[PDB]
Design a protein around this motif. Structure first.
Motif, PDB file in Angstrom:
ATOM      1  N   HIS B   1      47.807  29.263  38.027  1.00 46.16           N
ATOM      2  CA  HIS B   1      46.605  29.998  38.402  1.00 46.16           C
ATOM      3  C   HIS B   1      46.935  31.395  38.930  1.00 46.16           C
ATOM      4  N   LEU B   2      46.091  31.898  39.816  1.00 51.78           N
ATOM      5  CA  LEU B   2      46.301  33.156  40.520  1.00 51.78           C
ATOM      6  C   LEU B   2      47.607  33.126  41.310  1.00 51.78           C
ATOM      7  N   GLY B   3      48.243  34.281  41.462  1.00 51.08           N
ATOM      8  CA  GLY B   3      49.523  34.350  42.143  1.00 51.08           C
ATOM      9  C   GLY B   3      49.364  34.289  43.652  1.00 51.08           C
ATOM     10  N   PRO B   4      50.298  34.923  44.381  1.00 53.54           N
ATOM     11  CA  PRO B   4      50.295  34.968  45.847  1.00 53.54           C
ATOM     12  C   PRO B   4      49.001  35.561  46.384  1.00 53.54           C
ATOM     13  N   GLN B   5      48.648  35.147  47.592  1.00 48.49           N
ATOM     14  CA  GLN B   5      47.369  35.479  48.186  1.00 48.49           C
ATOM     15  C   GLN B   5      47.356  36.911  48.732  1.00 48.49           C
ATOM     16  N   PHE B   6      47.170  37.870  47.833  1.00 48.53           N
ATOM     17  CA  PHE B   6      47.047  39.262  48.238  1.00 48.53           C
ATOM     18  C   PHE B   6      46.172  40.022  47.256  1.00 48.53           C
ATOM     19  N   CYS B   7      45.430  40.997  47.768  1.00 48.86           N
ATOM     20  CA  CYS B   7      44.602  41.850  46.929  1.00 48.86           C
ATOM     21  C   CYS B   7      45.498  42.607  45.958  1.00 48.86           C
ATOM     22  N   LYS B   8      45.328  42.369  44.662  1.00 47.63           N
ATOM     23  CA  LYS B   8      46.232  42.954  43.674  1.00 47.63           C
ATOM     24  C   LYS B   8      46.006  44.461  43.519  1.00 47.63           C
ATOM     25  N   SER B   9      44.970  44.978  44.176  1.00 46.76           N
ATOM     26  CA  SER B   9      44.676  46.408  44.143  1.00 46.76           C
ATOM     27  C   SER B   9      45.377  47.176  45.254  1.00 46.76           C
ATOM     28  N   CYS B  10      45.348  46.629  46.465  1.00 48.01           N
ATOM     29  CA  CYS B  10      45.928  47.315  47.613  1.00 48.01           C
ATOM     30  C   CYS B  10      47.188  46.615  48.108  1.00 48.01           C
ATOM     31  N   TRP B  11      47.488  45.450  47.533  1.00 49.08           N
ATOM     32  CA  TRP B  11      48.689  44.679  47.871  1.00 49.08           C
ATOM     33  C   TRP B  11      48.921  44.519  49.369  1.00 49.08           C
ATOM     34  N   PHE B  12      47.854  44.327  50.139  1.00 46.10           N
ATOM     35  CA  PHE B  12      48.009  44.237  51.587  1.00 46.10           C
ATOM     36  C   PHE B  12      47.096  43.218  52.263  1.00 46.10           C
TER      37      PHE B  12
ATOM     38  N   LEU C  30      42.642  57.125  47.705  1.00 44.98           N
ATOM     39  CA  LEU C  30      43.683  57.565  48.628  1.00 44.98           C
ATOM     40  C   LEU C  30      43.320  57.228  50.066  1.00 44.98           C
ATOM     41  N   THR C  31      42.052  57.434  50.403  1.00 43.38           N
ATOM     42  CA  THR C  31      41.550  57.154  51.741  1.00 43.38           C
ATOM     43  C   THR C  31      41.708  55.674  52.068  1.00 43.38           C
ATOM     44  N   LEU C  32      41.291  54.826  51.134  1.00 39.26           N
ATOM     45  CA  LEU C  32      41.375  53.384  51.315  1.00 39.26           C
ATOM     46  C   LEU C  32      42.823  52.919  51.433  1.00 39.26           C
ATOM     47  N   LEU C  33      43.711  53.552  50.674  1.00 38.52           N
ATOM     48  CA  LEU C  33      45.129  53.208  50.713  1.00 38.52           C
ATOM     49  C   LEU C  33      45.787  53.631  52.026  1.00 38.52           C
ATOM     50  N   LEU C  34      45.409  54.799  52.536  1.00 36.37           N
ATOM     51  CA  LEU C  34      45.944  55.283  53.804  1.00 36.37           C
ATOM     52  C   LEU C  34      45.455  54.407  54.949  1.00 36.37           C
ATOM     53  N   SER C  35      44.229  53.913  54.806  1.00 39.66           N
ATOM     54  CA  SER C  35      43.655  52.927  55.716  1.00 39.66           C
ATOM     55  C   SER C  35      44.560  51.712  55.914  1.00 39.66           C
ATOM     56  N   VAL C  36      45.337  51.376  54.889  1.00 41.08           N
ATOM     57  CA  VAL C  36      46.102  50.137  54.899  1.00 41.08           C
ATOM     58  C   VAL C  36      47.587  50.363  55.199  1.00 41.08           C
ATOM     59  N   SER C  37      48.128  51.490  54.739  1.00 40.53           N
ATOM     60  CA  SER C  37      49.539  51.814  54.949  1.00 40.53           C
ATOM     61  C   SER C  37      49.852  53.242  54.520  1.00 40.53           C
TER      62      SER C  37
ATOM     63  N   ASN D  38      54.911  49.946  57.229  1.00 43.63           N
ATOM     64  CA  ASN D  38      54.545  48.537  57.324  1.00 43.63           C
ATOM     65  C   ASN D  38      54.638  47.832  55.974  1.00 43.63           C
ATOM     66  N   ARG D  39      54.845  48.617  54.920  1.00 43.90           N
ATOM     67  CA  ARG D  39      54.891  48.090  53.562  1.00 43.90           C
ATOM     68  C   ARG D  39      56.312  48.081  53.005  1.00 43.90           C
ATOM     69  N   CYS D  40      56.698  46.944  52.432  1.00 43.79           N
ATOM     70  CA  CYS D  40      58.045  46.733  51.912  1.00 43.79           C
ATOM     71  C   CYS D  40      58.250  47.452  50.579  1.00 43.79           C
ATOM     72  N   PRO D  41      59.361  48.196  50.449  1.00 45.93           N
ATOM     73  CA  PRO D  41      59.639  48.953  49.223  1.00 45.93           C
ATOM     74  C   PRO D  41      60.194  48.077  48.104  1.00 45.93           C
TER      75      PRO D  41
END
Ligand SMILES: [Zn+2]
Ligand SMILES: [Zn+2]
Ligand SMILES: [Zn+2]
Ligand SMILES: [Zn+2]
Ligand SMILES: [Zn+2]
Ligand SMILES: [Zn+2]
Ligand SMILES: [Zn+2]
Ligand SMILES: [Zn+2]
Ligand SMILES: [Zn+2]
Ligand SMILES: [Zn+2]
Ligand SMILES: [Zn+2]
Ligand SMILES: [Zn+2]
Ligand SMILES: [Zn+2]
Ligand SMILES: [Zn+2]
Ligand SMILES: [Zn+2]
Ligand SMILES: [Zn+2]
Ligand SMILES: [Zn+2]
Ligand SMILES: [Zn+2]
Ligand SMILES: [Zn+2]
Ligand SMILES: [Zn+2]
Ligand SMILES: [Zn+2]
Ligand SMILES: [Zn+2]
Ligand SMILES: [Zn+2]
Ligand SMILES: [Zn+2]
Lengths: 51, 51, 53, 53, 51, 53, 53, 51, 53, 51, 51, 53
Positions: B1-12, C30-37, D38-41
């Protein structure tokens, strides 16, 4: 630039081609794709609103 | 199914995840993507209209 | 160098694009991404924080 | 799941390893990485900030 | 030659970069790598002893 | 076998799907493809001409 | 452009070659392919139906 | 686990093999590699100090 | 042609390098390889037996 | 074993298929290939002399 | 054109090489290959009948 | 393990096959290869010199 002169959706039509972002689309295919969404399923970028 | 539990858009983001077709999306990302088109740029399939 | 002028995050926006390290990003994304990291999830390098002269 | 027990950043340390999302990281490497973002490279996902129970 | 100006270990630092064999390394990363071995885990070749 | 239930041509339609050889096709797409040839441009094998029992 | 002058279907014939879209085809192979469909199974584009001037 | 029983450095010796991290090494190869660094050029991980 | 000047076997030695067919080899490594066979395990072609003028 | 039931040469015929070494061949294609050589251009192995 | 000057079958002989279609073949290898079929197993094209 | 029973050197012979390390070799091909080196150009490992019990 864009590759060989063929609709990248139906791989057959070479005339009446509209320039999509990195490929081509025939009029019939472009219409059906616009019918369904504003985003192209082939290149993930916006569809041509021209023609 | 779907992979690891993370938003694939923002990966966070890992909480408040909506199930896209073969991946996940956080609420913020899903909103911004719906803002721009009905088709997902990550998996080329339609975006969730839920939530 | 950098590819076609479209936001590599949303693949839709083509104006108001900021240069990330090897691709583009629209302001909203970009704004949304900076919001996160401070680090970009697309190219693994730091997000543009400043637009320069 | 996660591969052989070695820090995927320095490929040397095998004890005192923290679980990042799909790989391991030793404390020294993790510290240096958190210093920068905070994000892993390596895996593009968030760095472990907490070791849990 | 070497690619974009970033430490290939931490993918973040762009200043105070030492030239490793086919990539770059920031001072902090280079130190930690030298701390552990004379051989670079990124390019498999010897680490810079300079700086 | 066949993947997620979506037309592999338009990647949008999920109902009224016909089984092509290793993927699906919606009726509208299938019609347009048959208009052009008996052979599918996606999987290189013959297009479904008949839906069976 | 097109590669070495050999029929990409039978990889043997080198004379009497017709230009398909990004490769060649000998007359015998082309005939058999047209017998089955107007679309080429090798390059997914239409088979040459006409040799031009 | 480890693949076929051969020194992954010289691809020839099958006897007197030491277990490196995800492959094998014959005694002669292991010695020459230890002679040069503590880190294995084949798998990027530390060399066996055993034997 | 041949890449950066390092022994492709031990990835460390950079002086006293002999030209193998598409890469380099230091004397120590070359000696050990000749000990085992006339054929190089890295490039599948014959090992340099002679250094020429 | 062999994949889907189609002549790997013409990708169309599904009946009257002869078993080539790791794929299929329709009678017409097999004939034309035998006409030209004993070795199959698709799988590099010998063609079926049967049928 | 053709790559480095070596028989692509035995990867050893560099003298008395015959030009196959996109690679080389030493006389011994060419003979053994002709012994078995008119079609080359390396490049799928016809073998040289010369020499 | 080892694939279909054909000499991976000549892709034709299927009887009188000797087991090389991850593939097969017919006697004629094996003989010619041993003539040139003890190391196999196909799998980079040593050629079978002996057939065992
Ligand atoms: Zn079309
Ligand atoms: Zn498009
Ligand atoms: Zn998100
Ligand atoms: Zn999606
Ligand atoms: Zn965007
Ligand atoms: Zn970026
Ligand atoms: Zn570490
Ligand atoms: Zn990580
Ligand atoms: Zn660094
Ligand atoms: Zn390095
Ligand atoms: Zn469709
Ligand atoms: Zn299809
Ligand atoms: Zn042909
Ligand atoms: Zn074609
Ligand atoms: Zn060895
Ligand atoms: Zn190792
Ligand atoms: Zn060496
Ligand atoms: Zn070599
Ligand atoms: Zn056929
Ligand atoms: Zn075959
Ligand atoms: Zn040869
Ligand atoms: Zn050849
Ligand atoms: Zn053979
Ligand atoms: Zn072998």
């Amino acid at each position: 630039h864009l590759g060989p002169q063929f609709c990248k959706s139906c791989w057959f039509e070479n005339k009446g081609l509209v320039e999509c972002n990195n490929h081509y689309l025939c009029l019939n295919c472009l219409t059906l794709l616009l019918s369904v969404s504003n985003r192209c399923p082939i290149c993930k970028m916006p569809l041509p609103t021209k023609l």
